[PDB]
């Protein structure tokens, strides 16, 4: 409640050259983020506490219920700091520092063990990472494999000609209309 203005956040000193009169720093946000404390004569810069969006990776409910949690855009060593009573809306802070945390560009996920081979994508994550429920059982994270690597031998006087063929039938589905509604 510096200068008779309520708010919430953490406090750090900033080097912005406040003139002998100006007391508050402001930008496009237009929500107070810097206060000159009347207690002493220093400069305080306010930023909101660390936050994020919680994403849950879950396989089929009947298959299992063990889940891997992903926090977007936060340092992986920041989430252990969150483990306190009456500091988080969730109380399931047990997953904050559990199994081997793997760091990705979109934050670091917990509860999943990172293999270094490749497979096909089962549950997308972001930045080329996918997760699945493989074998006694656990959730694993890998990197997508685009496809089987192949090479074609090119020479300037050789040609390949088929000697056989095969006939295939391929299906396709297209919507055409929908229900008519009156209100």
């Amino acid at each position: 409640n510096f200068n008779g203005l309520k708010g919430t956040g953490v406090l750090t000193e900033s080097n912005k050259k406040f003139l002998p009169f100006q007391q508050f720093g402001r930008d496009i946000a237009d929500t107070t983020d810097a206060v000159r404390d009347p207690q002493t004569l220093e400069i305080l810069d306010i930023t909101p506490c660390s936050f994020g969006g919680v994403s849950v990776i879950t396989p089929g409910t009947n298959t299992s219920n063990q889940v891997a949690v992903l926090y977007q855009g936060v340092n992986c060593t920041e989430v252990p700091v969150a483990i306190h009573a009456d500091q988080l809306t969730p109380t399931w802070r047990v997953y904050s520092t559990g199994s081997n945390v793997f760091q990705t560009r979109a934050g670091c996920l917990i509860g999943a063990e990172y293999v270094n081979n490749s497979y096909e994508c089962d549950i997308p994550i972001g930045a080329g990472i996918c997760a699945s429920y493989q074998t006694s059982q656990s959730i694993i994270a890998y990197t997508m494999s685009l496809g089987a690597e192949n090479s074609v031998a090119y020479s300037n006087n050789s040609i390949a000609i088929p000697t056989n063929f095969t006939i295939s039938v391929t299906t396709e589905i297209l919507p055409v209309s929908m229900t008519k509604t009156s209100v």
Partner: protein, 195 residues
């Protein structure tokens, strides 16, 4: 085989399933929408009349009329958007029927994977399902080829097909099927010399 493929997995008809899901889903969020008080005393309509004086109950009843009225516009606007993507997908289906079914399509990878032959339509709820029949080349055997041939001091080029060799002497054959034929003047034509 295609009969079993549909009956094997139930995820084949996903595109025709969410069409009815989305419209049925938007109705439910519309019925539950009137439960909100919208900042008024109560969501029930007629009771607020008998509980409050008519002089200022208009203020209370106005903030609830606008709350429900705004809900309808959001629903209608959603329908216009959804009707836009369906119509943009029915024209594609109509184009497929006029080209793939009624004729043979030269547009590569438009009416199936491979070389197109002919198709069949089948009806479905809120949609249509095609059966593209295509031609896929099988295993291949490589050879040695030369662009032209010079016999009487004049270069010869194939009429249709490409010259291939098996080691002893040359042959001419189609591009898509190995049917070797003896080199002949009927299969070639002459143009210029061979230097």
């Amino acid at each position: 085989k295609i009969q079993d493929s549909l009956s094997s997995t139930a995820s084949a008809l996903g595109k025709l399933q969410d069409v009815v899901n989305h419209n049925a889903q938007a109705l439910n969020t519309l019925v539950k929408q009137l439960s909100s008080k919208f900042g008024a005393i109560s969501s029930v309509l007629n009771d607020i009349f008998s509980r409050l004086d008519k002089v200022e109950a208009e203020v209370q009843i106005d903030r609830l009329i606008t709350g429900r009225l705004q809900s309808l516009q959001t629903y209608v606007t959603q329908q216009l958007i959804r009707a836009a993507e369906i119509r943009a997908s029915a024209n594609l289906a109509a184009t497929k029927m006029s080209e793939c079914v009624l004729g043979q399509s030269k547009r590569v990878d438009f009416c199936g994977k491979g070389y197109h032959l002919m198709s069949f339509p089948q009806s479905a709820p809120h949609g249509v399902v095609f059966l593209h029949v295509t031609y896929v080349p099988a295993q291949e055997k490589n050879f040695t080829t030369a662009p032209a041939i010079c016999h009487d001091g004049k270069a010869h080029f194939p009429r249709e097909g490409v010259f291939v060799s098996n080691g002893t002497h040359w042959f001419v054959t189609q591009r898509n099927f190995y049917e070797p034929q003896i080199i002949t003047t009927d299969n070639t034509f002459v143009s210029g010399n061979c230097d």
